[PDB]
Structure formats: C-alpha cells, structure tokens
Ligand SMILES: *C/C=C(C)/C=C/C=C(C)/C=C/C1=C(C)CCCC1(C)C
Ligand SMILES: CCCCCCCCCCCCCCCCCCCC
Ligand SMILES: CCCCCC
Ligand SMILES: CCCCCC
Ligand SMILES: [Kr]
Ligand SMILES: [Kr]
Ligand SMILES: [Kr]
Ligand SMILES: [Kr]
Ligand SMILES: [Kr]
Ligand SMILES: [Kr]
Ligand SMILES: [Kr]
Ligand SMILES: [Kr]
C-alpha cells in the first residue's frame with residue numbers, strides 16, 4: 186500500500202506536468218480571445234506539479250506532510266473558480282462571486298486541514314469534516330445555479346464543466362473518511378491523488394473544449 190501510494194504520487198507528478206505543457210501547446214488551437222482559461226488551467230496544473238514533486242519526496246521520506254496537499258488546494262481551487270465564473274459573469278457580478286466563492290473554498294480547505302491534522306475519529310476530526318461538508322454543499326449548489334442564460338453549444342460545454350466538478354469533487358470527502366472505515370491511512374492519499382488528476386487534468390481539457398466551442402469550432 187505504501188509503495189503503491191509512492192508510485193501514484195510519481196505518476197501524478199508527471200501527469201500534472203503533462204497537463205501543464207499539453208494545455209500550453211493546445212492554446213494555439215483556439216482564438217487568442219478565448220485563451221485565458223487555458224493559461225489558468227496550465228497554471229493550476231503547474232502549481233500542482235510543483236506540490237506533487239514535494240508530496241512524493243515527503244511520502245518517500247517516511248514523514249508525510251499533508252500540509253503540502255492543503256496548501257496546493259488553497260491556491261488551485263480559487264484559480265479553478267476564477268475560470269468557471271468567467272464563463273457566466275463579468276464586472277461586479279464576476280468580482281463578487283470570485284470573492285464569495287474564494288472565502289468559502291478557503292474555509293472549506295482550512296476546516297479540512299484542522300480536522301485532518303487531528304486524530305482520526307476525534308471530535309476535532311468530525312468538526313473539520315462537518316464544517317467543510319456544509320461549505321462544499323454551499324459551493325456545489327451555487328455551481329448548480331450558474332449558467333441559466335447560456336445557449337446551445339456553450340450551454341452543453343459549461344454543463345460538462347459543472348458535472349465534472351459535481352461528480353469529481355465527491356472523491357475528496359470519501360478520501361477524508363477512508364481512515365475511519367479501515368486501517369487504510371494510505372488510501373486517503375491514493376483517493377486524493379486520483380481526484381487531483383481527474384479534476385485538474387479533466388477541467389483543463391473541458392476548459393479547452395469550451396475555448397474551442399467559443400472559437401466557433
Ligand atoms: C485541485 C484540487 C482540488 C479541486 C481540491 C479539492 C478539495 C476539496 C473539494 C475538499 C473537500 C473536503 C470536504 C468536503 C470534507 C473533508 C475535508 C475536505 C477539505 C477534504
Ligand atoms: C502564458 C501563461 C502560462 C502560465 C502557466 C505556466 C505554467 C506554470 C509553471 C509552473 C508553476 C509552479 C509554481 C511554483 C510555486 C508554487 C507555490 C509555492 C508555495 C508552496
Ligand atoms: C459590492 C462590494 C461589497 C463590499 C463589502 C462590504
Ligand atoms: C447532503 C450532503 C451531506 C452528506 C454528509 C455525509
Ligand atoms: Kr502507480
Ligand atoms: Kr495517478
Ligand atoms: Kr497520470
Ligand atoms: Kr489537461
Ligand atoms: Kr497539443
Ligand atoms: Kr478565464
Ligand atoms: Kr485545470
Ligand atoms: Kr472556463
């Protein structure tokens with residue numbers, strides 16, 4: 186389980202670099218005016234690459250620091266919302282959502298950190314879980330209500346972004362509780378790494394598909 190967890194960090198390290206550079210090279214496939222989302226997805230993949238390098242070395246040391254994962258999440262999740270909100274919003278409406286979602290994300294991730302760095306099953310562990318789950322549900326319900334005014338191909342492209350988030354982000358709370366269901370500490374790390382690859386690489390690809398639709402492809 187330990188050696189599988191290590192190999193998955195290394196697979197995910199190269200996966201995030203490939204995400205980064207695949208998206209940068211793919212930016213020539215779309216009109217300059219729809220490229221900003223692709224550049225941000227590459228920056229999200231790039232921050233993750235940098236932290237996955239650290240997390241792999243941290244795991245291989247025998248003294249894993251979950252701080253490296255949670256710092257990755259506090260930076261990348263708000264960048265991922267900057268992308269999604271830009272499909273449907275501009276001016277004050279964009280700035281207010283980015284502010285409000287950004288606060289919610291930071292509280293979600295901070296609470297998770299507080300609980301994860303407590304003993305599994307302790308009142309601290311559950312307090313963290315419940316406060317993060319509530320915030321998570323607030324974000325997902327906000328996300329579900331975005332894009333009522335989109336038409337045709339742009340509407341379907343955005344629905345694919347939303348469904349990837351609505352389904353892919355469920356893996357994080359499953360990872361968080363893995364260590365109470367069994368003697369499976371390393372399975373938390375496995376589930377988080379798979380989620381990060383699906384969610385960062387998957388979102389990169391769907392943001393690219395959106396940039397192609399908006400370019401009239
Ligand atoms: C690129 C990284 C992403 C999208 C990471 C997302 C992380 C979460 C959505 C975490 C959510 C959590 C809960 C809802 C409950 C337990 C605590 C967390 C932080 C694992
Ligand atoms: C044309 C614009 C392209 C932007 C994306 C380029 C890809 C990013 C390169 C890697 C980023 C790594 C950043 C390292 C610092 C992470 C934070 C450190 C604090 C723990
Ligand atoms: C419209 C911006 C809100 C400012 C917060 C008091
Ligand atoms: C309705 C979402 C809450 C689920 C708690 C495990
Ligand atoms: Kr692996
Ligand atoms: Kr992976
Ligand atoms: Kr990968
Ligand atoms: Kr990607
Ligand atoms: Kr490409
Ligand atoms: Kr964007
Ligand atoms: Kr991304
Ligand atoms: Kr987007």
Ligand SMILES: [Kr]
Pocket residue numbers: 262263264266267282283284286287
């Ligand atoms: Kr945000």
Ligand SMILES: [Kr]
Pocket residue numbers: 314315318
């Ligand atoms: Kr809950």
Ligand SMILES: [Kr]
Pocket residue numbers: 315
């Ligand atoms: Kr609970």
Ligand SMILES: [Kr]
Pocket residue numbers: 320321322324325354
């Ligand atoms: Kr969320």
Ligand SMILES: [Kr]
Pocket residue numbers: 324325328350
């Ligand atoms: Kr969200």
Ligand SMILES: [Kr]
Pocket residue numbers: 352353355356
């Ligand atoms: Kr899932």
Ligand SMILES: [Kr]
Pocket residue numbers: 356359
């Ligand atoms: Kr799963």
Ligand SMILES: [Kr]
Pocket residue numbers: 363366367369372
């Ligand atoms: Kr498990």
Ligand SMILES: [Kr]
Pocket residue numbers: 189190191193194374375378
């Ligand atoms: Kr992993």
Ligand SMILES: [Kr]
Pocket residue numbers: 379382383
């Ligand atoms: Kr994966």
Ligand SMILES: [Kr]
Pocket residue numbers: 379
């Ligand atoms: Kr998977």
